[model samples]
Target chain A: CSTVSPGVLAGIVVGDLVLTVLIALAVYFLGRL
Target chain B: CSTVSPGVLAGIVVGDLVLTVLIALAVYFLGRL
Candidate 1:
């Protein structure tokens, strides 16, 4: 019984998006400005 | 150069007193009641 979840996958997607946004902001603050 | 052992010994004596009280209560509740 190996099944994936849609809501949990959406959460993971949001987490990754948030992590990427944080990284991008950090790079913009520390590297470009 | 250590001379502060009285308070620790006092704490140990207090711990022994608390343990004695706990054992007495346990015996009284579960053994006689």
Candidate 2:
């Protein structure tokens, strides 16, 4: 069975969300330039 | 040191890849409509 804990999974999801938002914001701003 | 194991990291990477592909596909299809 996988040893991954819920806490770790939650952190990963949150981190990914942050990264996705940052990338989207960057692209949107740069696209306007 | 971080408590996260390599196995956990690999899983996270794989999960992220799957999610990215799904999101990309969704956006592509939506844009074409």
Candidate 3:
């Protein structure tokens, strides 16, 4: 019970990728770009 | 007697916020109407 789990790793990858792109979308639209 | 881990904060919290992106998509969409 020491090392990290793949479950958490996937969350970092998937979550960040999706969120990063999504933020660009949100920011652009919000900025009137 | 241990410090907080980055994974738990970064990995888990931001990971959970994936729904935030999901929700924001809808927010942006609805904002248009």
Candidate 4:
């Protein structure tokens, strides 16, 4: 939390994880339709 | 490419990578307009 670089890095990676899942889920469901 | 899980995981991740940047760039330009 106090560590600036670590915090930023973690946030970016977490953002990537969340975004990736959302996209994959969308594609999976949409493609199935 | 060989392993099923690994290939799927990597494809999903790369899809996310291309997508996030695509939106980010679109937003930067369109948001400014």
Q: What TM-score do all the candidates reach, one by one?
A: 0.39, 0.44, 0.37, 0.43
Q: Candidates sorted by TM-score, descending order?
A: 2, 4, 1, 3
How many clashes does each candidate structure show, in the order listed?
Answer: 0, 0, 0, 0
Q: Which model scores highest in TM-score?
A: 2
Judged by DockQ, which candidate is best?
A: 3
Pitting candidate 1 against candidate 2, the one with the higher DockQ is 2
DockQ of each: 0.01, 0.10, 0.11, 0.07
Put down candidate 2 lDDT per residue, B1-33, tens digits, no spaces.
455555666577677776666656655566232
Model 3, A1-33: lDDT tens digits are 344445565556676667767766766668332
Alpha-carbon error at A31 in model 2, in Å? 0.8
TM-score of chain A of each: 0.59, 0.65, 0.50, 0.64
lDDT of 4 by residue, A1-33 (tens): 332234444455567778867655655565575
lDDT: which is higher, 2 or 4?
A: 2
User: Candidate 3 — which residues are off by over 4 angstroms?
Assistant: A1-3, B1-33
Q: Which stretches of candidate 4 lie over 4 Å from their true place?
A: A1-5, B1-33
Docking class of 1: incorrect
**Pairs that collide, model 2:** none
| Deviation in Å, model 4, residue B13 alpha carbon | 12
The digit string of per-residue lDDT tens for model 1 on B1-33 reads: 234234544555455555555544544565454
Better of 1 and 3 by DockQ: 3
Clashing pairs in 4: none
The Cα error of candidate 4 at residue B31, in Å, is 25
